[PDB]
């Protein structure tokens, strides 16, 4: 027994490319398509849900997961790496900051924290690079609202809106040409719907899609009442009907 | 591409594991040997090629016993096989120490199953070239099991493994129709005695040396128990009157 | 076993050189292009972001120079991931020499430091190198302004002005140029802005794509200052020197 | 205990330190140092446990020692002491820490100005104008309370020394065989072999 | 063929072979020759030393495990020096913690199991070296035949090595006669002499070149070399 | 609180003659004040001509013994039968118990 | 690639034969067993005249009753001349006296085959065999003067005489004739130095050629220069002699 | 966790991985060293390929191992540092026990100890370094020169030269140095040492440093004038023929 | 080059092979199995197919019970099956030990598919060939099926099939919700449910079972068993009057 793998299974080639992540982000590119546009306030992200029999319950299955009570991640790539890195960023935020500081670590933080994690996967003994890319959105006091997006690679960058997987050099002109910066969340959600349309081939309604956005403090979802500093959390999931209604005035 | 058979743990292209099948092989190859479930107990018996005359007449026992209550029989690479036995015996202490009970048959034979299963697990490890053939008395019944280089393993009426497996088998099947009540301890030991017989033709060059073993709940207790002496003659004859 | 897959990234060519290293060099080749340049009074970094987007947040980045220290800045070219990992064990050390002598890290030993941490992966561990190459901008009290640079294979070494990154070749031609050693900070400033200009691989060379940061000992005040250039701040200095 | 003193005068330091070394009943030396050069400019005394002692000495020489060649240059006193009082503070909760006092005086060749400081076993580091360790303070302190001035020559300091040295020969009960005093300055390290009656 | 399958001893071959432990075995026919053969009463070793020059000794092959057992090797010596020695702290552990001798047949077991786990796992290498383990415990005399392969088995006599194969023939047939010398050590060496020679060929042996062992009854494992079996010569 | 030693009494004496030596002790094993046995060897014979006793606390005695003549045959073992001279066996006497310098062998011992 | 410990169709060991072909590259190195004393000689061999040929150090003294001298990559052979040193002392620490000779060279065998990437018996961490044989040379009250010769594969002999080294074939079958159960110290000296000049590639003299003994007396000693210088001639001055 | 035999043995008896490693040493710098009859003196060559480096702050090519013991090296250089740092430390830790400094050859055999220790231990390369270490016995005049390489082999040389075009170098100094009267002063020693670079420099005033050890502590680097001025004096030598 | 297909590292492609051929590995035993919510229930069917006479029928299962309240079918080789179904018990019993309350199903379902994407990054670990289907009513989801697989990815479904044949069983399921417009039988025995899972097994793989050619796993409120051959028996006679 006994991992012998203890060396790279990701090293440099002749002309100067890192096989593995060249071939991670190929993985990345047949990825159901995903987005996120930065609003002045509040950020949207969101996907799509594509099933993989009409005896699945989509539901169960969340493309667009919360970090943190103000930070919300989406992917394209593989839904498996995507579940533990997820599970891995969590808990991170807990050990290297919650339990050090006592609040929720800042978005660009986080971020850097999933990205080393990444990034190991691309040097350590015996292991792939994470098969996937993130979009990352968040809202701490000192910084505002922003927007990331983390590749196999490791590396991140920070985007006004922007668009990963299958569709997104189409998706990404789109957005270039109706993104400004006033725009409102509500605007950017209207956005965010129709550059979503132009990837979904069958049905587009509030059950084929996954949308959540990074805005105001929900107090109606805290749990309780009691502490003037605690408000809510800024991460809320659009139901399945609060999308539809948006949809009717497409 | 190929090379899917030079690395243990590898999936070939239609999900196969060459390396626990070429251990198969390695199987096939060796001696035979039986198992024989009755309506109390199980029968051990397996065929000894006698290579030379310098080989001392009984004692190259290849039959072996876990704890008290479990006999295992092997055909293939007989160290592997031991080794098999080793981390079996250990199982069961470490089973009877927790739980004072002597270790159930269905119980042993997962842990001989997860314990081979994890050797086509991983590539730095050969998988068993053997199949082991094993069972016993237990609280509720009488247990007989065969495993395979695979980790696959099934609850049988009677089993057999090695050069003349089809034979036996065949010989089998039959005892399992004109028989559906039953059988007892006593007549399984002769029938066992006979079918290694017979399906010795397959490596009829060399002379053989007969070996059974039995657990049965009324004739041995419960415990397993070597057959020998006058008992063992019994059957040799019975063979050797029907072998013509 | 496993050897099969080894790529052996620390071993030697027929020639004696370093596989990997090579080749990790050749990745950094492909980098923006950075660069470092060294006055009298200060010392300056400039380094061009490679591939943009209209999207892209220009505010909240700083993907090339990163503050190791209050006196220590680098630039990156190549793996920013990688360069991450190296630059957050370099701030370690930094804060380790201050705790344990109550003085701020001599800018070689830093560097030192850092360059045997890449050596390492270099002789073992069989790990592919950091694909990162840095430039170091920082002052101590025993050599004031110093400028280095280490790549991939855990060497380094001081300059005057170096650039790292993608067409080193001639970005260094024209520095070694219009260099001298009487420089200010501003001529330097200017210089810079003006090799990365001529070296681009785009159509113009506009203020989103840039970073720049000088550490300068402001007269007033007698201490070190590092400043890294805001977008506007950047915007200025580019329509200034002259190329709107 | 042991005799621990130091003085920061104009432009230098002064290490006095008593010569005994006793084994329970017997006086087995007289004529030991209890001090080592860290380098060229910074001097060390100690005292304390019988083995730590000198271990603690000759380790800490043997890492500025390393440092110097290293880098090719002098770590400043302040530097050299910042270190050892992290070596004393990480020990003392350790399995086994060492009980060994120091003082460190040193001269800054780069702000041309003599230091002293003073460590405790357990890591407790403070500059002074002079210090000792142990009850050598308790009778010295008075004494160089009242006649310290910043400005003293060399000279005057090892006069206020001499002082206090005799104050501590007459009212301290052990006999700790006289003591060996040693000066730093811009020069280097160099050693008054003439205190046993100057 | 063969030249994929037989890397290391982790790999088996399609037909379901381990040529690593078959290569092993290789090194022991290409070792010097040596016989073991037992009685009732005393079990007997007899070793044919090989030397490299004229100038060079004979390679001792015959070692002691304890005072109630001992071995011959044929093969790499090292191997056999690891061997003998586990084998050498079995025996210890035995009279020290349970005061009783260690059976031959449960030291065989030992050796096998041993053996084993160098074919199973990757890094390792089988023994090269075979061995004839003889001795007198609680039920007589014994006779082992080790193999690198991990099998051991108990015969009455036997021998390998290079032309192992005359003496093996040659003790098939004085079976009924030997297998009855008890009482009689000097008669079952002669006979293990007669049997060494079966497979000479080259020259004739000598004083310093024959080596001899013996264990039985009232008979502590001893070794004979030199004139000690120049009156068997 | 478990104290893991005891005292079994008995005692030894050793002489030396010109060309012979001797190594006696009684026979008898106590505990307090009640007696074990009236017949328990005290002294042995190792091989190599060599007698050892080790009195005092006799499971620590009897386990020296027992590791010092088990050490002689491995002195044979790896250096083909030489003869443990009696003073090779003192010095290496004085390892086996230096070895348990920090839990000793309550045992006074003579060869 | 494949086991750094695998063996070849012929019931070998790779990388000990491969092993035994960087030893045949060493330099000559020849030792005389007589009954009163053995004889160690060594071609010194530089490889340029400004390399200070009596820092060349082929011949080591494990013990003052045993010595060895070292032939292929000398390189590896500094922890095997540790590991002897050490064990020679430490029997005597253990046992107040001299370390058999037999036993010191068993002992250095043993480090021979703890080699590979992880085979299953112990802790064998060393990537490689050594490259380097040795001669070691000794005396003890049991077995007299000695000779042996310690190889990368583990296993050792005893010699009569003995020699290893690019020209060891050659002056082994030279060996086989000179050799006799009666040669003195002086004879065995001059036998050594006779048969090093034949086969090294330079012309023998007490600066490139090294000789030393073992007399139960006064132990294992090197020769000096001028010691040797003068058994040089007084062998030029035999062999014209007819 | 990584212990892969890199260094093993080839069909023919060579290991590879040392004999590549020495290829590296071929290619670094040229560097040599003379040693007089009171002083020893080490000469190396600085590249060319890119300039406007800043020579106060970059990493010189002969080190101080300590107060009497100086080494420099050929190949490359990240490894040369590892080596460098572990005699340092060995240095200290020599003093701090056997209370006297390292003796040249001592310090020497070290050095070698380490490089062949990563020539036969798995997961590691062999060094792809060879170097000069030269100084004085603590308390003697009597000058030192060693030579050491990946293989692990070291040795004294009355002058010797390792790196790129050593052949050439050496050579010269085979029918240049006479051992019957080596360069009796620290002047004609420096001499004969530039001598020898200036085969392979072409012309290089900088392109050329050299350090002067003499005996009991005394080490000290000439700079580009006393060097050229050197380099002045030889280039008439010539020319007055 | 050629070895991207032995371990489990991206291929030019982005592939993975060795997950890929992990599932081909999943249809060696030939056999087929699905199953359906009842309206507080849930059942799995799975065939059995004993060919030698030799075997003792009784002990030919790919049903586990992982817990009182879990039951979990295969769909792969019996050796990576049992495997699976041991890891799974442990873990479901180590979580009540720990958090102080039953695992839920999509928990375990979860974490097993976690356990199965590891063996997707690193090396050493090669992916079970094995199918894991897991079933039960949940205290706080009710009737609940969750399906993982050797790629490391897991959902819960209305009903589901697993086999050589699995698509035919799916489209018939598929198209009886369509129509009956409700996502789970609607019945209140359990006894009904397995016949109608049982019914459109047959109409789907278009043959007929005897009482040894099936294997039923039930789970209800506190409890998931296995019914007997007669059991069974009972139920294919049910089905037997009507059709």
Not at chain 1, 165 to 177: D, I, R
Not at chain 8, 157 to 163: D, N, Y
Not at chain 9, 208 to 236: C, P, Q
Request: glycine share 8%.
């Amino acid at each position: 027994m006994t991992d012998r793998y203890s060396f790279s299974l990701t090293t440099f080639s002749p002309s100067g490319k890192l096989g593995q992540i060249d071939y991670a982000l190929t993985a990345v590119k047949q990825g159901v398509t995903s987005l996120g546009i930065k609003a002045t306030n509040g950020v949207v992200i969101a996907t799509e849900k594509k099933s993989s029999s009409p005896l699945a319950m989509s539901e169960t299955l969340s493309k667009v997961s919360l970090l943190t009570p103000d930070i919300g991640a989406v992917y394209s790539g593989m839904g498996p790496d995507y579940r533990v890195l997820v599970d891995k960023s969590r808990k991170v935020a807990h050990t290297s900051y919650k339990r050090i500081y006592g609040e929720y670590p800042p978005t660009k933080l986080l971020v850097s924290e999933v990205a080393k994690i990444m990034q190991e996967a691309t040097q350590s003994g015996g292991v792939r690079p994470f098969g996937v890319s993130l979009l990352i959105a968040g809202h701490d006091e000192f910084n505002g609202f922003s927007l990331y997006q983390v590749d196999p690679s490791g590396s991140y960058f920070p985007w006004k809106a922007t668009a990963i997987g299958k569709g997104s050099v189409a998706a990404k002109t789109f957005l270039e040409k109706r993104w400004n910066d006033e725009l409102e969340l509500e605007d950017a959600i209207h956005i965010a719907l129709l550059t979503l349309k132009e990837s979904v081939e069958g049905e587009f309604n509030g059950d084929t899609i996954e949308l959540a956005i990074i805005g105001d403090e929900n107090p109606d979802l805290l749990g309780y009442t009691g502490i003037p500093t605690d408000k809510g959390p800024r991460f809320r999931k659009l139901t399945s009907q609060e999308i539809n209604d948006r949809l009717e005035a497409l | 591409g190929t090379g899917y058979d030079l690395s243990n743990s590898v999936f070939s292209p239609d999900g196969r594991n060459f390396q626990v099948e070429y251990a198969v092989k390695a199987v096939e190859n060796g001696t035979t040997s039986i198992g024989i479930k009755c309506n109390d107990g199980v029968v051990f018996a397996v065929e000894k090629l006698i290579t030379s005359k310098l080989l001392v007449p009984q004692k190259n026992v290849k039959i072996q016993v876990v704890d008290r209550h479990i006999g295992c029989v092997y055909s293939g690479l007989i160290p592997d096989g031991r080794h098999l036995v080793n981390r079996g015996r250990e199982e069961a202490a470490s089973f009877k120490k927790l739980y004072k009970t002597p270790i159930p048959i269905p119980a042993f034979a997962d842990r001989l199953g997860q314990y081979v299963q994890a050797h086509t697990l991983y590539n730095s490890v050969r998988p068993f070239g053997v199949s082991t053939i094993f069972g016993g008395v237990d609280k509720n019944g009488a247990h007989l099991y065969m495993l395979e280089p695979s980790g696959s393993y099934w609850g049988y009426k009677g089993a057999a493994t090695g050069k003349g497996r089809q034979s036996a088998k065949a010989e089998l099947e039959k005892l399992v129709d004109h028989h559906p009540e039953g059988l007892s301890a006593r007549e399984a030991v002769k029938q066992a005695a006979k079918i290694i017989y017979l399906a010795h033709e397959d490596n009829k060059e060399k002379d053989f040396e007969l070996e059974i073993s039995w657990c049965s709940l009324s004739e041995t207790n419960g415990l397993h128990k070597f057959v020998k002496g006058d008992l063992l003659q019994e059957a040799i004859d019975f063979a050797q009157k029907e072998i013509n | 076993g496993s050897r099969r897959y080894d790529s052996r990234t620390t071993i030697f060519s027929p020639e004696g050189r370093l596989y990997q290293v090579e080749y990790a060099l050749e990745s950094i080749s492909h980098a923006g292009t950075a660069i470092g340049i060294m006055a009298s009074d200060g010392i300056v970094l400039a380094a061009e972001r490679k591939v943009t987007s209209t999207l892209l947040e220009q505010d909240t980045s700083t993907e090339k120079l990163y503050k190791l220290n209050d006196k220590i800045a680098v630039a990156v070219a190549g793996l920013t991931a990688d360069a991450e990992i190296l630059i957050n064990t370099a701030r370690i050390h930094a804060q380790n020499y201050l705790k344990t002598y109550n003085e701020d890290i001599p800018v070689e030993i830093l560097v030192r430091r850092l360059s045997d941490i890449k050596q390492g992966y270099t002789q073992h561990g069989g790990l592919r190198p950091f694909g990162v190459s840095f430039i170091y901008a920082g002052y101590d009290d025993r050599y004031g302004y110093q400028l280095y640079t280490s790549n991939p294979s855990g060497n380094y070494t001081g300059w005057k002005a170096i650039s790292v990154g993608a067409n080193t070749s001639a970005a260094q031609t024209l520095l070694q140029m219009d260099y001298k050693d009487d420089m200010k900070v501003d001529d330097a400033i200017e210089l810079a802005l003006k090799t990365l200009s001529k070296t681009t691989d785009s159509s113009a060379l506009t203020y989103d794509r840039l970073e720049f940061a000088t550490i300068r000992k402001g007269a007033n005040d007698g201490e070190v200052y590092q400043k890294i250039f805001k977008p506007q701040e950047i915007k200025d200095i580019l329509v200034k020197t002259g190329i709107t | 205990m042991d005799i621990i003193l130091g003085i920061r005068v104009q432009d230098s330091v002064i290490l006095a330190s008593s010569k005994a070394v006793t084994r329970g009943i017997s006086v087995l030396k007289d004529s030991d140092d209890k001090t080592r050069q860290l380098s060229p400019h910074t001097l060390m005394s100690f005292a304390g446990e019988a083995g730590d002692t000198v271990q603690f000495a000759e380790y800490i020489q043997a890492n500025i020692q390393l440092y110097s060649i290293r880098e090719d240059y002098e770590l400043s006193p302040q530097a050299v002491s910042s270190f050892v009082r992290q070596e004393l503070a990480k020990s003392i909760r350790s399995r086994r820490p060492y009980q060994v006092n120091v003082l460190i005086g040193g001269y800054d060749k780069k702000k041309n100005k003599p230091e002293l400081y003073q460590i405790d076993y357990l890591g407790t580091k403070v500059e002074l104008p002079y210090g000792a360790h142990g009850y050598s303070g308790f009778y010295t302190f008075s004494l160089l309370d009242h006649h310290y001035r910043p400005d003293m020559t060399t000279e005057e300091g090892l006069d206020l020394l001499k002082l206090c040295v005799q104050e501590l020969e007459k009212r301290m009960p052990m006999d700790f065989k006289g003591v060996i005093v040693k000066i730093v300055d811009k020069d280097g390290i160099r050693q008054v072999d003439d205190f046993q009656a100057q | 063929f063969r030249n994929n399958y037989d890397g290391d001893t982790v790999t088996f071959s399609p037909t379901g072979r381990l040529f690593q432990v078959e290569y092993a075995l290789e090194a022991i026919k290409q070792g010097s020759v040596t016989v073991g053969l037992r009685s009732n009463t005393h079990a007997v070793l007899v070793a044919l030393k090989r030397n490299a020059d004229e100038l060079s000794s004979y390679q001792k092959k015959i070692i002691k495990c304890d005072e109630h057992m001992g071995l011959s090797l044929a093969g790499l010596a090292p191997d056999a020096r690891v061997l003998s020695n586990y084998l050498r702290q079995q025996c210890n552990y035995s009279s020290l913690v349970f005061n009783r001798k260690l059976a031959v047949e449960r030291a065989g077991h030992l050796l096998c199991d041993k053996a084993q786990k160098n074919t199973q796992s990757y890094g390792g290498r089988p023994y090269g070296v075979g061995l004839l383990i003889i001795g007198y415990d609680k039920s007589g005399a014994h006779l082992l035949e080790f193999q690198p392969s991990g099998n051991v088995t108990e015969l009455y006599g036997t021998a390998i090595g290079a032309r192992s194969q005359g003496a093996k023939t040659y003790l098939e047939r004085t079976l009924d006669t030997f297998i009855k010398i008890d009482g009689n050590p000097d008669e079952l060496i002669k006979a293990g002499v007669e049997a060494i020679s079966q497979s000479l060929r080259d020259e004739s042996l000598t004083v310093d070149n024959l080596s001899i062992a013996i264990v039985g009854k009232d008979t502590p494992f001893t070794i004979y070399d030199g004139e000690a079996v120049a009156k068997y010569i | 609180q478990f104290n893991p030693y005891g005292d079994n009494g008995g005692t030894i004496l050793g002489i030396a003659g010109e060309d012979f030596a001797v190594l006696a002790g009684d026979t008898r094993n106590i505990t307090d004040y009640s007696i074990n046995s009236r017949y328990e060897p005290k002294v042995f014979d190792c091989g190599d001509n060599i007698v050892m006793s080790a009195n005092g606390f006799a499971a620590d005695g009897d386990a020296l013994v027992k590791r010092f003549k088990n050490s002689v045959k491995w002195y044979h073992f790896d250096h083909n039968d030489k003869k443990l001279s009696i003073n090779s066996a003192a010095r290496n006497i004085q390892h086996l118990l230096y070895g348990k310098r920090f839990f000793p062998y309550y045992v006074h011992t003579i060869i | 690639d494949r086991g750094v410990s695998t063996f070849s169709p012929e019931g070998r060991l790779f990388q000990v034969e491969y092993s035994l072909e960087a030893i045949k590259l060493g330099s000559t190195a020849i030792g005389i067993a007589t009954k009163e004393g053995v004889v160690l000689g060594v071609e010194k061999r530089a490889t340029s005249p400004l390399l200070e040929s009596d820092s060349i150090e082929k011949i080591v003294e494990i013990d003052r009753h045993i010595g060895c001298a070292m032939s292929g990559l000398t390189a590896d052979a500094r922890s095997m001349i540790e590991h002897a040193r050490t064990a020679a002392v430490t029997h005597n620490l253990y046992y107040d006296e001299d370390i058999n000779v037999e036993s010191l060279t068993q002992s250095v065998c043993d480090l021979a085959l703890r080699f590979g990437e992880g085979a299953s018996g112990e802790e064998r961490l060393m990537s490689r065999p050594f490259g380097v044989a040795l001669l070691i040379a000794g005396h003890d009250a049991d077995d007299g003067y000695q000779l042996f010769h310690a190889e990368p594969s583990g296993t050792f002999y005893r010699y009569n005489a003995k020699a290893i080294g690019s020209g060891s074939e050659g002056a082994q079958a030279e060996l086989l004739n000179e050799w006799h159960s009666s040669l003195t110290l002086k004879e065995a000296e001059l036998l050594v130095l006779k048969i090093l000049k034949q086969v090294m590639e330079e012309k023998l003299d007490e600066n490139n050629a090294q000789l030393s003994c073992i007399t139960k007396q006064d132990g294992f000693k090197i020769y000096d220069n001028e010691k040797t210088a003068e058994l040089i001639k007084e062998l030029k001055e035999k062999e014209a002699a007819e | 966790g990584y212990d892969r035999a890199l260094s093993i043995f080839s069909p023919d008896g060579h290991i590879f991985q040392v004999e590549y490693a020495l290829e590296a040493v071929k290619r670094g710098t040229c560097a040599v060293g003379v040693k007089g009859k009171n002083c020893v003196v080490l000469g190396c060559e600085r590249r060319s390929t890119l300039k406007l480096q800043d020579t106060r702050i970059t990493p010189s090519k002969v080190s101080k191992i300590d107060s009497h013991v100086v080494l420099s090296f050929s190949g490359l250089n990240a490894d040369s540092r590892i080596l460098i740092e572990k005699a340092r430390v060995e240095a200290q830790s020599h003093r701090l026990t056997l209370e006297d400094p390292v003796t040249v050859e001592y310090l020497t055999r070290y050095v070698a100890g380490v490089q062949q220790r990563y020539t036969q231990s798995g997961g590691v390369r062999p060094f792809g370094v060879s170097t000069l270490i030269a100084g004085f016995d603590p308390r003697d005049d009597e000058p030192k020169l060693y030579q050491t390489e990946p293989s692990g082999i070291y040795s004294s040389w009355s002058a010797q030269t390792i790196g790129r075009n050593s052949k050439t170098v050496r050579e010269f100094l085979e029918k240049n140095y006479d051992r019957k009267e080596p360069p009796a002063t620290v002047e004609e020693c420096v001499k004969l040492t530039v001598r020898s670079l200036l085969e392979v420099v072409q012309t290089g005033a900088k392109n050329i440093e050299i350090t002067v050890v003499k005996p009991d502590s005394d080490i000290v680097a000439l700079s580009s004038e006393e060097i050229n001025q050197y380099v002045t004096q030889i280039e008439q030598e010539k020319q007055e023929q | 080059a050629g070895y991207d297909r032995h371990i489990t590292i991206f291929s030019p492609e982005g592939r993975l092979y060795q997950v890929e051929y992990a599932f081909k590995a999943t249809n060696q035993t030939n056999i087929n199995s699905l199953a359906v919510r009842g309206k507080d229930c849930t059942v799995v069917i799975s065939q059995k197919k004993v060919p030698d006479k030799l075997l003792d029928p009784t002990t030919v299962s790919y049903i586990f019970c992982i817990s009182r309240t879990i039951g979990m079918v295969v769909n792969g080789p019996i050796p990576d099956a049992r495997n699976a179904a041991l890891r799974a018990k442990a873990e479901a019993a180590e979580f009540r030990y720990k958090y102080g309350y039953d695992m839920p199903c999509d928990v375990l379902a979860k974490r097993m598919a976690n356990l199965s994407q590891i063996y997707t990054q690193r090396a050493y670990m090669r992916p079970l060939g094995v199918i894991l289907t897991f079933v039960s009513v949940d205290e706080e989801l009710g009737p609940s099926i969750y399906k993982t697989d050797p790629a490391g990815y897991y959902v819960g479904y209305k009903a589901t099939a697993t086999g050589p044949k699995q698509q035919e069983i799916t489209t018939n399921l598929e198209n009886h919700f369509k129509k009956s417009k409700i996502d789970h039988i609607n019945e209140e025995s359990w006894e009904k449910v397995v016949e109608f899972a049982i019914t459109h097994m047959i109409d789907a793989l278009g043959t007929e079972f005897s009482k040894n050619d099936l294997e039923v796993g039930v789970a209800t409120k506190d409890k998931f068993f296995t019914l007997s051959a007669e059991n069974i028996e009972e139920r294919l006679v049910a089905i037997a009057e009507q059709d």
